[model samples]
Target: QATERALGRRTIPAGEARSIIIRQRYDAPVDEVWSACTDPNRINRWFIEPKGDLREGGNFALQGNASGDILRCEPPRRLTISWVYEGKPDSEVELRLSEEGDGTLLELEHATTSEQMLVEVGVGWEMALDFLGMFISPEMMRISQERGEAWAALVHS
Candidate 1:
């Protein structure tokens, strides 16, 4: 549900970076949520198809999407990665997970200098999290492209 999603924006004055933060709560344990994100097979079903060395310090390429280095990986908890798309290496994405009650809380932060990219990414991540939610809990309603685009338009506004 949208009620389970939280979105915010921040600016890093030190680096002149704008960031979009999105948090979602999943009705699953931390390890399970972590596995769904890190496991290549499981990730392909929800996010994008990823291929690479896939460990800390390794590089990964998302099928038809961004490619970059995995900066930090602390199992079942935190992951930070460079997000290079179209040869731009100035962006980074971080994922943090924590146990909340019997479920898990997932927080995603994408930081970059491009404000335009932030808007696009904000909506993109929202849809991706929605996909992740449905993938983890089969009973959740699927988000359609039309609905997603509508939300994107709202974000653009």
Candidate 2:
């Protein structure tokens, strides 16, 4: 549920960079959460139809948004990538998953250069995860796009 999505920020390792972290606990198993994030076929159901070899050091291009290299891949636990959207310089995004009691906890961190980008960056992740939540619960799939619109106000303000 978009209402359950949590947003936060923290300083990143070894740098002056800060990250916008988005978190959500899906009512699904860890493996299902993993595949929905890593598999292109599954991703297409909620997110962009990504095209590329998705492995450590490989680069991926999302239909109309971003392209970046996979920096780390730890199967059902964690994945990190460099994200350069449209005309912007590269930034880093990491997804970490953990098994909770009968569910999965997903933590996504996107490193950005400054705090000023929070509202903008936050809204992007908010919407993306909104799609992800819908994918996990297909019955609620009908709500993401509409909820995404409503979420923009909260995220921005």
Candidate 3:
């Protein structure tokens, strides 16, 4: 089964940054979801392998991907990080989770000045979220390459 998901894009006027917001619902407790996201073992199962101090103010590097500093870590609720891919300081990613009706609502927002990159970034997160759903719920469907291509086409259009 596929969980509920929402995707959105917006402009932050203050910094002229474009943000991609993805909301996903997991039929699991907020704390469990938080643990899956923060724990290296669980994260490796769903997303890319992560290496770092794994704490607030610590630095983290994703395997073959982005690296950044953990700006804030509010346990089981909120996390914000500086997404320093390619040595860029203007990009940031925030993850917020909340308990909702026997499930957890996860809101992921990535803000960057690179407006042109939003399409690829959005699709990447969509795939990652799908992987997360599968990890959290064994019955969840696997990610579809067709869906990813469709999203990229829609965003590009």
Candidate 4:
């Protein structure tokens, strides 16, 4: 239920005042949601390069973007990575999931980010999460490709 707004919004204390916690629910099982979050193929369909060895204490790098080791990863439950960046505190991207009926609830938070970097992270995840919503429907997924261009609209408008 993408339309069901969060119960409330709060700031994250990783370091930045401009943190975001985006919540999205998917009409898929927990395993399906886990795959979309961890599987390399599914990640490329939505967000950054999900390549490299994905495992606990394993080093993973986004094609040309960023790199870090898995700080935490546990099946369909939790995932947190140390997102290293230059001249900035080590940032992080965490994914938390919960079971809801036959579907899944996904909460993503990117914290310890600089204000200058906030726009990119925010818009990028916005586009990616919208794609994740369509992962269950081929027809919807096809249309979501156009939604890839939605980032610019999100920034300017």
Candidate 5:
């Protein structure tokens, strides 16, 4: 009933005071989706990334954004990291993956954020996930960064 009403669920827990939960379905294998999110080459396409050892207590840095300690990491299933976004209420990003009949279910929750950060973070995740689904080929992923940068530059200028 709950999933039916919302299709996917997004909830704000009490006492936490702030955060957002975005859940979606992806038509890719769990390993495929997980690789797309974690791999340096794959990540460069959709989001900023880090290539060094990614695990619990490991230090990882995103390309442009601030880097923080990797608080938790579970291979091929889940990842949790200390999130730093400048002066915008730094927090954590928890990514959970579960296998479904056809593909994988992606449950991503970016927590501990201010209202302004929430809007921006939400949009970024939405775009990243949406793009990942359609862009699968290696060549396409390679050009992704260039396309994104060009568009960003044009839009800003």
Candidate 6:
């Protein structure tokens, strides 16, 4: 119930582009949560060690993960990036943040058109968001391959 309450899933369509959206609420201020998602130093704490500039049009490489260009950035609100993972071409990852009571609501959407890609991207984002949720609550992380496997099973079942 904890994960279910913290995260919500929906399929969104924009013309011909269909996106898998994972929405989550973090128990942190907008600024704090935004920093956690964007700042290179803070990002490494929860996510991978990201390298490169962090501005609109700047390129970033999430070490051992994905690399992309920062297409748009508006602090404490929204960030859009071109995410290219592994040998795949570029896909868009957009994060929108807003206030939700005493915390922050993070809406993440990764637009692509493959069933295989959806499974990989969806589970990955869920894990990443779980990390951020734990980090913002300032608690020890519960991320592991086992947990990810369970989550994937539960969701895909």
User: Hey, what RMSD does candidate 5 come out at?
Assistant: 8.7
- The true-versus-predicted C-alpha distance at residue 80 of model 6, in Å, is 0.4
Which one wins by TM-score: 4 or 5? 4
Q: Which ten residues in a row have the lowest lDDT in candidate 4?
A: 3-12
The reply for model 4, stretches above 4 Å from the true place, is 3-18, 86-89, 137-157
* Higher-scoring candidate on lDDT, 2 or 6: 2
Candidate 3 structure, TM-score to reference: 0.78
- Model 4 C-alpha lDDT per residue in residues 1-157, reported as the tens digit of each score: 6632121222434554434467788788888899988988887787676566889988788876688879899888899887776665666778888999998888887765465454456555766677677665597555444443342343342
- Compared with the true structure, all predictions reach lDDT values of 0.76, 0.74, 0.75, 0.68, 0.64, 0.71
TM-score of 4: 0.71
lDDT of 6 at 93: 78
Q: What TM-score would every model get versus the actual structure?
A: 0.79, 0.77, 0.78, 0.71, 0.70, 0.76
The Cα error of candidate 2 at residue 120, in Å, is 1.5
Instruction: Order the candidates by TM-score, highest first.
Output: 1, 3, 2, 6, 4, 5
Report the lDDT tens digits of candidate 6 across residue range 53-105: 87899988876778888888999899988777766645677899999898877
Estimate, for each residue in 1-157, the C-alpha lDDT of model 3 and write its tens digit: 3433334544442266756777888889999999999999999999987798999999899978699888899999999887766644357788999999889889888877774556556667877887898899233233444555554565554
For lDDT, candidate 1 versus 4, the one ahead is 1
**Poorest 10 consecutive residues of model 2 by lDDT?**
1-10
Candidate 5: where is the Cα deviation over 4 Å? 1-17, 137-157
Identify the superior model by lDDT, candidate 1 or candidate 5.
1
lDDT for position 34 in model 6: 90
